[PDB]
Amino acid sequence: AMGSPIFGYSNTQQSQRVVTADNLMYLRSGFAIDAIGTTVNNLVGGPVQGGVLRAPIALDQLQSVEVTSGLYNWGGYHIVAIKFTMKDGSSVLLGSTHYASNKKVETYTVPQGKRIKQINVWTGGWLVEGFQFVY
């Protein structure tokens, strides 16, 4: 009712970012998810120097998410891919499903009438291990 569940894992360090009036979610990704934020300057995760910045997600138009996490081929357990499906049916896939094993796929629909106001991000300083929407 008050937020999404925690996708992925929650054993690393949680930071919190406020969604702006643009209602945008920014990510750095490559073979996995490196960082998550709400501006190009406040991303939480690995260092800018670690993946590369992608186009942001319009949270006001986000319908559902499909989050792939598992044993990363280069070590540990992290979120390796997120697929964002928008209200109009189009989707975008950031990260990759192909460089991890023992994989879990989490699906969740953004409830009707909710605005995503904060994003919680769990990161160990290298990759993203979990994230959560707050309404």
Residue numbers in the entry: 820 to 868, 872 to 957
Q: What do the authors of the reporting publication say about this deposited model?
A:
β-prism folds in V. cholerae are not unique to VCC: three additional β-prism domains exist in two biofilm matrix proteins called RbmC (rugosity and biofilm structure modulator C) and Bap1 (biofilm associated protein 1). RbmC and Bap1 are related multidomain proteins with overlapping functions, involved in the surface attachment of biofilms and encapsulation of growing cell clusters. For simplicity, we refer to the two β-prism domains of RbmC as RbmC1 and RbmC2. Our results illustrate a common structural mechanism by which vibrio toxin and biofilm β-prism domains target glycans on host cell-surfaces, facilitating cell lysis in one case and cell attachment in another.
RbmC2 apo crystals were obtained with space group C2221, with three copies in the asymmetric unit. In the apo structure (with three protein molecules in the asymmetric unit), glycerol molecules from the cryo-protection solution are found in the glycan binding pocket. In two copies of the asymmetric unit, a water is present bound to W948 as in the mannotriose and GlcNAc-Man structures. In the third copy, a hydroxide group from a glycerol molecule replaces this position. As previously stated, the loop containing the N871 residue is unstructured in two of three copies of the asymmetric unit and the ordered copy is in a different conformation than in the ligand-occupied structures. This suggests that binding of the ligand may lead to the ordering of this loop and that the water molecule coordinated by N871 and W948 may help mediate this interaction. Comparing glycan-bound structures to the three copies of RbmC2 in the apo structure asymmetric unit revealed differences in a loop (with the sequence PVQGT), which is not present in the other vibrio lectin domains. Aside from the rearrangement of this loop, only subtle side-chain rearrangements of F850, W896, and W948 are observed between the apo and mannotriose-bound, and GlcNAc-Man-bound structures. The all-atom RMSD between the two ligand-bound structures is 0.21 Å2 and approximately 0.34 Å2 between liganded and apo (compared to 1.2 Å2 for RbmC2 vs. VCC β-prism).
